[PDB]
Each structure stands twice: as structure tokens, then as C-alpha cells.
Amino acid sequence: MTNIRKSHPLMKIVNNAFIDLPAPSNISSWWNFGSLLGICLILQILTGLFLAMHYTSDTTTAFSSVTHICRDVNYGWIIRYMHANGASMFFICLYMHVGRGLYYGSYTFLETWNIGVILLLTVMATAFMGYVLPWGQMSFWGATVITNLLSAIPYIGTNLVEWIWGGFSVDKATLTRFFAFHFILPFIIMAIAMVHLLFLHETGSNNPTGISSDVDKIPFHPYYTIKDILGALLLILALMLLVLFAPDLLGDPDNYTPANPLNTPPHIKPEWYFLFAYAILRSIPNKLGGVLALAFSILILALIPLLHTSKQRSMMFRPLSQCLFWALVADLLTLTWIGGQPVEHPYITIGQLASVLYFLLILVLMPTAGTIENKLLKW
Amino acid sequence: SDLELHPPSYPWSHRGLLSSLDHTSIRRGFQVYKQVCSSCHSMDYVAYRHLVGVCYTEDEAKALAEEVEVQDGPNEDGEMFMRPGKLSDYFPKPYPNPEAARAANNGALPPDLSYIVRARHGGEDYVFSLLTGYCEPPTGVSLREGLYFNPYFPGQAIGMAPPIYNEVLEFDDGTPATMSQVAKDVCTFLRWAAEPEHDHRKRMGLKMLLMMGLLLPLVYAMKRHKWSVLKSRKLAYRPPK
């Protein structure tokens, strides 16, 4: 070759994973969440860096600081409400991502699946510390009760909760830590994303049918660049619709109140993206039992590869799992509901059966259904 | 575990996506806060920057901000020799410091109104239905004098003196100062101190909606332009067999 810009630079060749790559034809709209996933990572970052261009990480000021970003600073208001709302999107997008993987068996790509999982959990940490930066009543308490929930561990716990906090409570020491880790996680996560992409590039994108498409492959540039741009267009739409018309709507927490360590919103809860795991935790009387089961909520993802029982990696051709897949999703919705519920009889009893349903759906029902379907097909 | 009553979706000029804030209301409301409310509740993030937000001129608010620094002035802030003039000063703190504040109101601590609308669950509805909601304690109920009964407080009891009562103040123009009429104006000024960007953001909304209605359709066509070859495509299979 001569003057083929792409492979001339070696660097520019590495970018031909976007333009020249084999991309399956058939492909639900669901896959745009990968790309959007990145979109969100880049938006949070640009946004973060500007907010962290006018934010301070002290008890005294932090609330003020945010308050000042939203008042005196030019276009700081949208930047901040764009950053808050974004993170919602970021999660809304994440959970589409994992749904798709669950449903079409994209998770067969074990190595890719394991990175995903790390991805998911890393963002999860990020979101947990950022929300505490503004140091408002919800944030303040939410950190205590989550962090303390780590003191369940018998031997260490206790010592360890105190190291993480940098003291006995959550004063300045903790507050500056979260500021620093919030800042540096996303950068580390981008490396991961790319590592994730790396592995995925070695086997390409699965499809709704569930079969290899090698016999049908398309230009990523021609087709999938417009799709992705279009995806954006809708993604942004949702992010501005939220951010411009209903800034606070999705941000359940109304606690714009500077944190007073004796005061407490009897209704303490993580934002929507954490409710599942909250609910699941409450269902267990015992503290430690609840922390294990909380971890297992999320950490149970990496099992599913091994659970796979059918011969069709595609759920597309299998009824019964399509029914229990949906139910889990609706069980997951049910759990999210509990999250914002008084912890009383009505909700308790419900959550408890939802938390068993979720683990049944994942651990026991689906796997059996797999088998059955295989046996009805005579496979 | 007491039922809490909840606020109506009270008819507001701004309830609607494009609806915006009514400054005259703001204006009025302001005074309400300043005469009725400055006494025990503070508004720390609010400067004397109503100018364009509240239609008070620069000269108007300068003057309005001057007398407030002459009486409550920077002597309560720590500017020994400070008097009339300044505009960077923030609304004057009812009391030196919180602890005091609770003493004046006996254990209770007058919440900073800056964000009340956006703070407390339930927005300006709650705030309006609190002030305007004050009914007779319920047969068989007991009440410590401070504990006035209010139909909309979580714990079913609030330490609030006559928030607002008819003819509490008087507005320049002549707006009929009804308990409620004044509340409608007081809330509105709160709405705004809670979210000063209210109007700009709804504006942009408008411009983001039009734009997006031109880009969404456009961009979709692009997407079909390109893909068309694929979708229009037809296939044939001819083995030698």
C-alpha cells in the first residue's frame, strides 16, 4: 500500500475498528446502548471536569459550592443538571445493555462478559461517591448507612469501615476522599471500556436470531455510523427533555438541605439505580446475610454463562425463557418500587417474595426452562 | 405514622412546560418575605440581585438593598463601620447564628427559605397549602401553645405563628392583600429563589424541542438514505446442483 491514510499511520489503522469492521446486518435497536454507553461516559467527564472547575470539597462549602455553580456561574446550572440527569441516563443505558446480553446470549463472550461486569460495578462506585459530593442530607446519610453496612464483616469490618471513612464518622476526611476517587474512577473506567471493546473485536456482535452472521456482514461506516448518530440524537433528546423540562423529576431526592448530622429523613434510600439492591438487602433480617445477598444481586451476573442450559444462545427462538426473562425484568421493576417504600409489613412481605423470585428466575427457573425447551425441540 | 395530607396541583402561571414566572407575583412575593418573613427565616444564597429577575431596577434594588444594610447592615455580618451602598451583600440573617434562632422560637430552627420549594418534598403546593392551611385541632386532641395544629405537617404539628393573615402588608400597586392572595405571591417569589434559572431553562426547552423536531426527522431520512440499498435488496440462490 501507498497513501492509504488508514494503514499508513499505525495509529490510524487502530481506528478502522469503527469504519471497516464486520458488523452483522440484522441487529435490533438494542445494540445502540453500547455506543450511547460510551457517549454517556464522555459527557459525564466533560461535564464533571467543568463542575470540578468550580466545586470545593469541604464540609463548609461543598453545599455552597454546588449552590454557587447553579447560581452565579454562567451556564453552570445546565452543566450541573446535565451532569446529574446524565448519570441517570448512564444507568438507564447500562441496564438496557445488560438486558440485551441476558436475552440474546451475548454473554457467551465470557471474557467480554467479565469486563462488562467490572464496568458495571466500577460505574456503580462512581455514582455512589459523586452523589455525596454535594453533601446534602440525602447524600450525608446514604453514605453512612451504606458504608456502615460494611461493618457487617465480623473480624475486620469495623476496623475497615473506619479506614474508608478516615475517622469515626463522615466529616471532611471522607468528603475529600470521595471527591478524589470520583475523579479518577471514570478515567480508569475508560481504560476498561477500551479493554472491553478489545476483546469484543475478536468475535464481533451477536444477533437477535442468535446464529453467526459471517455470511451476512456489513460496513460499519456506511450504516452503523448513522445509526449511532441517530441513537445519540434520541439519547440527548431524553437527556435534555429531563434536564430542561423536569430537572428534578427523575432525581427523587428533594433533599437540597445541608447535612445536619443529628437530623434524619426517616426515608433514607439510594437513587433509582440502586433501589433493586436496596430492596434485596432489607429482605434479610440479619445484617451480614443482607450484605452477602446484596453483593450476590449484582455479583450473580458472572454466573449466568455457567447457568446457560440451552443449545440456542438466542432467547429469540425460545418462548418459556422469554416469559421468565420478562418477569425478572418486571420483578426488577417491582423491587425498585419497594426501594422507595416505608419499611413496613405491606412492602416487607412483598419485597421478600420478590427477592426470592429474582434469585429463582436467575438461579433455578430459567435453567430448567432451558432444558425443557431443548427437550421439546428433541435437541 | 400519621397520614400526611398532600398539596393540590394548585393552578400556577408556570405549571406548564412553556409557562414562565410572573414577575409581578415575584415582586409582590418578595415584599411578603421581606416584611412578613425576614424576621425569623433567612435566604443566604439570595443576593440583592432581583434587578432583572424581579424587575426591580438597579437603582430600585440598590436603594432597597441600601436601607437593608443601613438597619440590619454589615454590623450583623462583622463590617463594624458598614452602612448603605453595597449590592454584593446577601439577605440579612435574622439572627447571629442558628443556636440563637432556635432560642427566639423556642427550640425550633427557622428553615432557610432559599430552597424550601425545592427542598421539602412537594414543592410550592405544600408551601402554599401550609401557610393557607390552618384548621381547628381535632376533637380529643391536645396542643402545647407552640404546637399549633396544621393539616399539612408530617408530624401533624408545627411551631408556626400566624404565617400570613389578611392585610399583613401593603403592596405598591394595590394588590388586594388576602391571606391567600399574599400566599400566591409569596410562594411564587420562593419558587424563583429556589430555581433562578426557571425561565431561561423553559426558554431553551422550547428551542431544544423545535430544533429536535428538525433533526430527528432529517437524521432519520439520512439513516434510510444509506440503509436503503440493504432494505431494498433482494436475493437469489442458484446452485449448480
Binding site: 472547575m53 447560581r71 456561574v73 454562567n74 | -
Partner: peptide, 26 residues
């Protein structure tokens, strides 16, 4: 779209009404 978006993000640095309030007022 890009123009305003970018512009907002740069004015976000230009000069905060906080500071600018005191500017030119002595």
C-alpha cells in the same frame, strides 16, 4: 446546536457573576 453548547461551556469559565459582581464597583 453545537455553537450554543460549546459557547455555554466556555462562558462557564469566562467570568462568574459572583466575581464579576464586584468588578467595576468601587
Amino acid at each position: 446546536a453545537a455553537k450554543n453548547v460549546v459557547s455555554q461551556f466556555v462562558s462557564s469559565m469566562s467570568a462568574s457573576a459572583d466575581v464579576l459582581a464586584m468588578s467595576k464597583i468601587e
